[PDB]
Design a protein around this nucleic acid. Structure first.
Ligand SMILES: [Mg+2]
Ligand SMILES: [Mg+2]
Ligand SMILES: [Mg+2]
Ligand SMILES: [Mg+2]
Ligand SMILES: [Mg+2]
Ligand SMILES: [Mg+2]
Ligand SMILES: [Mg+2]
Ligand SMILES: [Mg+2]
Ligand SMILES: [Mg+2]
Ligand SMILES: [Mg+2]
Ligand SMILES: [Mg+2]
Ligand SMILES: [Mg+2]
Ligand SMILES: [Mg+2]
Ligand SMILES: [Mg+2]
Ligand SMILES: [Mg+2]
Ligand SMILES: [Mg+2]
Ligand SMILES: [Mg+2]
Lengths: 206, 56, 63, 141, 56, 145, 143, 63, 55, 70
RNA sequence: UAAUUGCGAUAACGAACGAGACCUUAACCUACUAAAUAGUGGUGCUAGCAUUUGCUGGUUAUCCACUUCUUAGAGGGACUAUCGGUUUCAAGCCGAUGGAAGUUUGAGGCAAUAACAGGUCUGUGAUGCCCUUAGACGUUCUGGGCCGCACGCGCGCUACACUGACGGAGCCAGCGAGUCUAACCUUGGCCGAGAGGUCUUGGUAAUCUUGUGAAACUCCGUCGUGCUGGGGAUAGAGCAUUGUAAUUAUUGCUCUUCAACGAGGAAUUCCUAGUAAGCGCAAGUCAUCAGCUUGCGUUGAUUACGUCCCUGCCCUUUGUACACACC
C-alpha cells in the first residue's frame, strides 16, 4: 500500500487499512447486500464510515432519517431507558464489541448479519384499531418499508436489553445473540416471535 | 468612595428614583414634569423641569 | 408462501379516525399493468415497495 | 517567517484553533501527537481528514492545534474541522487552486461537516419547566 | 393512652378523606348586599350620554 | 492473579464472634455479617492482622482468624485512630471502645434506657415509637410498627 | 528521536512511573496509608492497599510537569469526585489536602518538584530529567 | 409559513407600477434600487419588498 | 422576579436587565490638555474617570 | 452462594478439557458451563492465556473475547 | 397562512389599531476600526529529551510585528435565492442545489378592543368605610408555636443494579457574583483522616478567586447475581462549623446500625432537534440551612411531520320569552 512516514509517526494497521478501503472499526462495508426487495434505499451500507458516531441532522426532514448509516441507527436505539439516555460512547463501544462477537460465530460479516437481522424481523403486514362503533374490530394493513426497518431495530434492541437485564451476560453478548438468531429467524429470538405474531394477528383479521 | 462599577451604576439609578419621587411629591402644584442629574467635577447638578418655575 | 411485491404508484391520503393510516395505489413489479389500492401503516412516499402478504384484496374507508 | 496559515473549527461552544506552517509533518493537539486524543473510540474521527485526502500531503507542513471550551466530544469534532480546513486553506495561498478544489471535493463528498461548521446550539430554557421545551407536571385536581 | 401504639389501634375519622367543601362559588355573580345603585347617582358620577354635547 | 488448588483445607461456614460466616465469600466482606463491623472496619482489621485480601473466608488459617478477632476487640492497642470506633468517650468511664456482635444490641439498650430513665425529650420520643432526629412526622413513616 | 511525557499515553506512563517509585524505595509514605480515604466523598479506601501513594504521586508529578504551578487546593479539586449524599442528590466535593500536600513534600524531598514563586509547586529541573527519562523507557516497551 | 403581508405586497405593486423601466429580474440590483428610489426604515423590510417586487417582475414577463 | 405581587396564578417569571459599557483610552499628555479634556466632554450618564502613572 | 465459587481440582481439569470447541469464550461463557463464578472466571481467562487455547481478539473490562487456538 | 396571513370571488373601493413590521439574544465575516485588563507568530532570556536542523515547557513587559482565534463598535448578509414539481398554474405549498443560516432562520420582549364580582387591603407613609386604641387588635422584651401525627391528596428527591456499584487513573464547559467607612469572593504555605483550623495574599474585577481541572462521561482493575459490595431509610456513639442562642437534634465530618424497594393496579403528566431524557454548575433566598426556583453549559436518542377518535377552545348556521345576559 506504499507506506509513508512523517515527524509524528502514524501506525501500520492505522496507515494500512484507512487509505486503502474505507471501512469500519475494522470490517468490510463492501459485500453486505440486502437480501430482500424493498428494504433497500432504507438500509444504508455505502456510504461507508469508521465508527458509528456521527453528528448529522436526521430529524429536521421527514424521510432523511433513512440516510443514516444503519449500523449507527442500530446504536442510537441502544441508548435509552432513562439512565442510558445520551451515553453514545457507551453504545458505540458496545456495538464494536457486539460485531466482534457476531463475527466469531458463523463468520460472514457482522455488519451483514445486522442487515439480515433487520430484514427478517420487519413485519410485512400488521393491524390497527378501527372503531366501527362500540366494540372495535382490527383492520389488516401493509406496513411501509421505513416502519419495517424502525420496528425491526426497536424490536431487536429491546429484546436484547430485557434479556441482558438481571443476568451475568452483557449487553454486547445478548445483542449479538439476538442478531445471530435473527439473521435467519430461529424463533428463539424475542424479535422474530413478535414479528411473526404481528402477522399472525394481521392474518386472522382480514 | 471605592465602589464596584456594577454597584456604582445601580446606586446612581436608585438615587435618581428617590430624587425623582421627592420632587413629584413636593412640587406637584408647580407642575413638576420630572428631572435629570448631571454629575460634574466640583458639583452635582439637578435640573427641575416644571411648567411653573416662579413658585419653585 | 406466495410472496407478492408491489411498488407505490401514488399517495391518495390519510384514512383512519386517528389518521395514522394512508391510502395508496400500487403496481406489482412481477406481472405489471394491474393496480390495487392498499392501506399502509408507517410513513410513505412515492416509489416505495410494499410487500403484500396476500395478492388479491383491498379496502377503502376506515373508522 | 515561512509559509504559514491559521484556521479554526467550532462545534457547540468549543473552538479549536490550528496553525499550519511548512515543515516535516508533525500533527499535534495542545501538547501532543494526534495519535492519542482519548476518547479514542472517536479516535478515527480526527484521523479522518488525513485518510480522506491521503496520508501524505502533510509531509511538507506542520500542524499544531489547541482547544478551549466544549467537552470530551464537542472538542473532537472541532479539532478535525480545523485540521481539514487548514489543509485546504494552505493550498489556497501557496499551492495551486486546482489542488485545493480537489481537496474540498474529497472532503465534502463524504464529510462530517469538515469544512463547514454545524450551526446547532442550545435553546434557552423558559420558566415553567426544567427544559427548554419541557413543561412541569400538573395534577389538575 | 399515649404513643404510636394507641393511635395506630384507633379508627380514622371520615373527615380526613373529605373534599374541598365549596360553600358559595356558584352564587358569585349575585350580590348579597340587597342594595344596588341608582341611575341618577350614577349619571352624577359618570355623566349621561344625554347631556354629552354640553360636555364636549 | 493466579490459579490455585489447595485440597480439603478450606471449610465453608466458619463460626466466630458468636455468629456464623459464609466460607465462599471474600474475607473482608465475610467479616461484615458480624454486628458492629462494617466495610471500613473489616478492611483495616484484615490489613492490620497481615492477611491477604484476595483470600476468601473459608481459607486463611485458624491462626489468622484468631489474630483477626484479637484486633477487633482491642483496636486502640494495635494502633487504630479511635475516630475510627463506634463508641468513644463513653459517658461513664470515658474510655474508647468498639462494641461488637451481640454486645452492640446491648449498648443500644443501655443508651436508649439512659435517655428514658433521665426523662430527656429524646428518651420520651423513643418511648412513643416516633422519630427522634426531628423530622416532620405528618407525611412520612406511615406503615412502620 | 527525543522525548517528552507528552509523547506517552496518559495511563501507561503513570503506571510505569508508579512501578518505578515502587521498585525504588525512596518514598516518604506517611503510614496512615491503607487507613485513609483519599476523599470525604468516598465510601471505601483505595483497593491497591500497599501502593497507590505511588500512583497519585506519579499522577501528581506528571500533572505539575504539564503546567506552570499547582497548589494543594488545586489537587484537592482535581482528584475530588462526586459524593453520594445518600437519598439526596450528588454534588462535587474536594479531596484530602493531607494526602496531596504530603505527596507534594514527599516528591520534593525526593527532588521531582520545588516550591515555586507566585505560589504553588513547579516541576523541578531534575524532575523534567527523570520524567522524560522513564517516558522514553515506556516507548521502549512498544518498540 | 411564509406569506408576505399587505405592506410588502402593497409597495411592490406601487413600485412595478411607476418604475418598470429599470428594475429587473434580479433581486440584488432591485434591492439597491429601493435604497435609492424608496424610503424604508429597515434592511429586513426592504429585502422582503425587493424580493417580492422581483417575484412579480419575473412572472410579468410570462404575461 | 415573578410578576404578581401576591402568589396566585400560573407562575410568570420576568427578567429585567441593565447593561454596563466600559471603555478605556490611554493618553500620553502634558498637564494642560488632560485638565482641558476632563472639564469639557462631560455628559449625563457617562462616568468619566482619569487615573494616573503606572501603579 | 450456589456452587461455582472456589477451585475443586476436578474442575481445573474440566476446564482444560472442555475449553476447546468453544468458538466464543468469556466470563459469561465460563459461568454458563455450570461452574466458575465470575471472579475465578476472570482469573481463568488470564491463566488459559498464559499458553494457547485462546486468542485475545478483544480488550477490556465488561467485555472479553477469545477463540479456540490454531 | 402561525395569523381578518394573503389569493380569489365580489356593491363595494381604498385605509388605520391588533398580527406583521419592530426590539433583544444565539448563529456567519482571514473585509473595517483596535487591544499588557484578550490572544498569536518571531526574537531575546531560559529548562528538559534527543541530538542532524528538532520536540516540549518556563520568563504580567527583554523587545519587534500582527488581529485568525477573544472582546464590541460601524457595516455587510437572506429576500424562503436559483432550478424544478404541484395548485383556480393565484396566494402558496413540496423537493433538489447553493448557502453561516431557509420550521415566523432558532428562542424571546412588546402586544389592540372586551370580559371575571379570578387573586392581592399580609408589599406600599396607596385608599373609602367599619372595628380597635392604654388591662391596646399600637409597640417592644422573655419563652413557646407555624416542624406538632391513627390517616387522605399533590410537586419532588433517591432507588430496586452487571448500558451496574465500588477503587484507582484520564480529564472538558457555560450563565454568574464578589469587601467602605468594611470583613465580601478567596489563590498560596503549613497543621489535621475528615469536616476544618492557622499564617499570609490578589481583587471594587476581561487584571484576583477562576482554565471556576463541575458532573455525567472515557480508561484499568475489584465484585458475579445472591436484597449482593444494589439501596441508604431508621438509629447509637464521637468530632467540627454558623450564631447571643442549635434541646424538638440548622449544616458539615467519622465509625456503627443496613429498613422498604425484584419496574409498580385503576388512572394520569410532558414532549418534535442540539429538542426529549440523563448530568452537574452559577444566581435568587442566605449569619447558618436547597431535596425549590431562575438561568447555564456538558452527553445526546427513539418516533410523528398526520388526523378529528377522545379532550379543550374558536367559527359560522340556528332557536330564544335571556340583556343584571343560563350564576
Ligand atoms: Mg455490619
Ligand atoms: Mg474532576
Ligand atoms: Mg476521580
Ligand atoms: Mg476579527
Ligand atoms: Mg445543503
Ligand atoms: Mg370573589
Ligand atoms: Mg395591594
Ligand atoms: Mg408552613
Ligand atoms: Mg406546580
Ligand atoms: Mg452503596
Ligand atoms: Mg467511576
Ligand atoms: Mg487529629
Ligand atoms: Mg445488602
Ligand atoms: Mg418502567
Ligand atoms: Mg445557594
Ligand atoms: Mg421556595
Ligand atoms: Mg336573533
Amino acid at each position: 500500500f506504499t507506506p509513508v512516514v512523517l515527524a509524528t509517526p502514524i501506525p501500520e494497521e492505522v496507515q494500512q487499512a484507512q487509505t486503502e478501503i474505507k471501512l469500519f472499526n475494522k470490517w468490510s462495508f463492501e459485500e453486505v447486500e440486502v437480501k430482500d426487495a424493498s428494504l433497500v434505499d432504507y438500509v444504508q451500507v455505502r456510504q461507508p464510515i469508521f465508527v458509528a458516531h456521527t453528528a448529522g441532522r436526521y430529524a429536521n426532514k421527514r424521510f432523511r432519517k433513512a440516510q443514516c448509516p444503519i449500523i449507527e441507527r442500530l446504536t442510537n436505539s441502544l441508548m435509552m431507558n432513562g439512565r442510558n439516555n445520551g451515553k453514545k460512547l457507551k453504545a458505540v463501544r458496545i456495538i464494536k464489541h457486539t460485531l466482534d462477537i457476531i463475527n466469531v460465530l458463523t463468520d460472514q460479516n457482522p455488519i451483514q448479519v445486522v442487515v439480515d437481522a433487520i430484514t427478517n424481523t420487519g413485519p410485512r403486514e400488521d393491524t390497527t384499531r378501527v372503531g366501527g362503533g362500540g366494540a372495535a374490530r382490527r383492520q389488516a394493513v401493509d406496513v411501509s418499508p421505513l416502519r419495517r426497518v424502525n420496528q425491526a431495530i426497536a424490536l431487536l434492541t429491546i429484546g436484547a436489553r430485557e434479556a441482558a437485564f438481571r443476568n451475568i451476560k452483557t449487553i454486547a453478548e445478548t445483542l449479538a445473540e439476538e442478531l445471530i438468531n435473527a439473521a435467519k429467524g430461529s424463533s428463539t429470538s424475542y424479535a422474530i416471535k413478535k414479528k411473526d405474531e404481528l402477522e399472525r394477528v394481521a392474518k386472522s383479521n382480514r | 468612595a471605592l465602589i464596584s462599577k456594577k454597584r456604582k451604576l445601580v446606586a446612581d439609578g436608585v438615587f435618581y428614583a428617590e430624587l425623582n419621587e421627592f420632587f413629584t411629591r413636593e412640587l406637584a402644584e408647580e407642575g413638576y414634569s420630572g428631572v435629570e442629574v448631571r454629575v460634574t467635577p466640583t458639583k452635582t447638578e439637578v435640573i427641575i423641569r416644571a411648567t411653573r418655575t416662579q413658585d419653585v | 408462501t406466495p410472496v407478492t411485491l408491489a411498488k407505490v404508484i401514488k399517495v391518495l391520503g390519510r384514512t383512519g379516525s386517528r389518521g395514522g393510516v394512508t391510502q395508496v395505489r400500487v403496481e406489482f413489479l412481477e406481472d405489471t399493468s394491474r393496480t390495487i389500492v392498499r392501506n399502509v401503516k408507517g410513513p410513505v412516499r412515492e416509489n416505495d415497495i410494499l410487500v403484500l402478504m396476500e395478492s388479491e384484496r383491498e379496502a377503502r374507508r376506515l373508522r | 517567517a515561512v509559509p504559514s496559515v491559521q484556521t479554526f473549527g467550532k462545534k457547540k461552544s468549543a473552538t479549536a484553533v490550528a496553525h499550519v506552517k511548512a515543515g516535516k509533518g508533525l500533527i499535534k493537539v495542545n501538547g501532543s501527537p494526534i495519535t492519542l486524543v482519548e476518547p479514542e473510540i472517536l479516535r478515527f474521527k480526527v484521523y479522518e481528514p488525513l485518510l480522506l485526502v491521503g496520508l501524505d500531503k502533510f509531509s511538507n507542513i506542520d500542524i499544531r492545534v489547541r482547544v478551549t471550551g466544549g467537552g470530551h466530544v464537542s472538542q473532537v469534532y472541532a479539532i478535525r474541522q480545523a485540521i481539514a480546513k487548514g489543509l485546504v486553506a494552505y493550498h489556497q495561498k501557496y499551492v495551486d487552486e486546482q489542488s485545493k478544489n480537489e481537496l474540498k471535493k474529497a472532503f465534502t463528498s463524504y464529510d462530517r461537516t469538515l469544512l463547514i461548521a454545524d450551526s446547532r446550539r442550545p435553546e434557552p430554557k423558559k420558566f415553567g419547566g426544567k427544559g427548554a421545551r419541557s413543561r412541569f407536571q400538573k395534577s389538575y385536581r | 393512652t399515649a404513643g404510636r401504639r394507641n393511635n395506630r389501634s384507633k379508627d380514622v375519622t371520615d373527615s380526613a378523606t373529605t373534599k374541598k367543601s365549596n360553600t358559595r362559588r356558584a352564587t358569585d355573580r349575585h350580590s348579597r348586599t340587597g342594595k344596588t345603585d341608582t341611575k341618577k347617582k350614577v349619571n352624577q358620577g359618570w355623566g349621561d350620554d344625554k347631556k354629552e354635547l354640553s360636555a364636549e | 492473579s493466579l490459579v490455585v488448588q489447595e485440597q480439603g483445607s478450606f471449610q465453608h461456614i466458619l463460626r466466630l464472634l458468636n455468629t456464623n460466616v459464609d466460607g465462599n465469600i471474600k474475607i473482608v466482606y465475610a467479616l461484615t455479617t458480624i454486628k458492629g463491623v462494617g466495610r471500613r472496619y473489616s478492611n483495616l482489621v484484615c490489613k492490620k492482622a497481615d492477611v491477604d485480601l484476595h483470600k476468601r473466608a473459608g481459607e486463611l488459617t485458624q491462626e489468622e482468624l484468631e489474630r483477626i478477632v484479637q484486633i477487633m476487640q482491642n483496636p486502640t492497642h494495635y494502633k487504630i485512630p479511635a475516630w475510627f470506633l463506634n463508641r468513644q468517650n463513653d459517658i461513664t468511664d470515658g474510655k474508647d471502645y468498639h462494641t461488637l456482635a451481640n454486645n452492640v444490641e446491648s449498648k443500644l439498650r443501655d443508651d436508649l434506657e439512659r435517655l428514658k430513665k433521665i426523662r430527656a425529650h429524646r428518651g420520651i420520643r423513643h418511648f412513643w415509637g416516633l422519630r427522634v432526629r426531628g423530622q416532620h412526622t405528618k407525611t412520612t413513616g406511615r406503615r412502620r410498627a | 528521536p527525543g522525548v517528552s511525557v507528552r509523547d506517552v499515553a496518559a495511563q501507561d506512563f503513570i503506571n510505569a512511573y508508579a512501578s518505578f517509585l515502587q521498585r525504588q524505595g525512596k518514598l516518604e509514605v506517611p503510614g496512615y496509608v491503607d487507613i485513609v480515604k483519599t476523599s470525604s466523598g468516598n465510601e471505601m479506601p483505595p483497593q491497591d492497599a500497599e501502593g497507590w501513594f505511588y500512583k497519585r504521586a506519579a499522577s501528581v508529578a506528571r500533572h505539575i510537569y504539564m503546567r506552570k504551578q499547582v497548589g494543594v487546593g488545586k489537587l484537592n479539586k482535581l482528584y475530588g469526585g462526586a459524593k453520594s449524599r445518600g437519598v439526596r442528590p450528588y454534588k462535587h466535593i474536594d479531596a484530602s489536602g493531607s494526602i496531596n500536600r504530603k505527596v507534594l513534600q514527599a516528591l520534593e524531598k525526593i527532588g521531582i518538584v520545588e516550591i515555586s514563586p507566585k505560589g504553588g509547586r513547579r516541576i523541578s529541573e531534575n524532575g523534567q530529567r527523570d520524567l522524560d527519562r522513564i517516558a522514553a523507557q515506556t516507548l521502549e516497551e512498544d518498540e | 409559513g411564509r406569506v408576505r403581508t399587505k405592506t410588502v405586497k402593497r409597495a411592490s405593486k406601487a413600485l412595478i407600477e411607476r418604475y418598470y423601466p429599470k428594475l429587473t429580474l434580479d433581486f440584488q440590483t432591485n434591492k439597491r434600487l429601493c435604497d435609492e428610489i424608496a424610503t424604508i426604515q429597515s434592511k429586513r423590510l426592504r429585502n422582503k419588498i425587493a424580493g417580492y417586487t422581483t417575484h412579480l417582475m419575473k412572472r410579468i414577463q410570462k404575461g | 422576579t415573578r410578576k404578581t405581587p401576591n402568589g396566585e396564578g400560573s407562575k410568570t417569571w420576568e427578567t429585567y436587565e441593565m447593561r454596563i459599557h466600559k471603555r478605556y483610552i490611554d493618553l500620553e499628555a502634558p498637564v494642560q490638555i488632560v485638565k482641558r479634556i476632563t472639564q469639557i466632554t462631560i455628559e449625563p450618564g457617562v462616568d468619566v474617570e482619569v487615573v494616573v502613572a503606572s501603579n | 452462594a450456589q456452587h461455582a465459587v472456589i477451585l475443586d481440582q476436578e474442575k481445573y481439569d474440566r476446564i482444560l478439557k472442555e475449553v476447546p470447541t468453544y468458538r466464543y469464550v468469556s466470563v459469561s461463557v465460563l459461568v454458563d458451563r455450570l461452574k466458575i463464578g465470575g471472579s475465578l472466571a476472570r482469573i481463568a481467562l488470564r491463566h488459559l492465556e498464559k499458553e494457547g487455547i485462546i486468542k485475545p481478539i478483544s480488550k477490556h473490562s465488561k467485555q472479553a473475547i477469545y477463540t479456540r487456538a490454531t
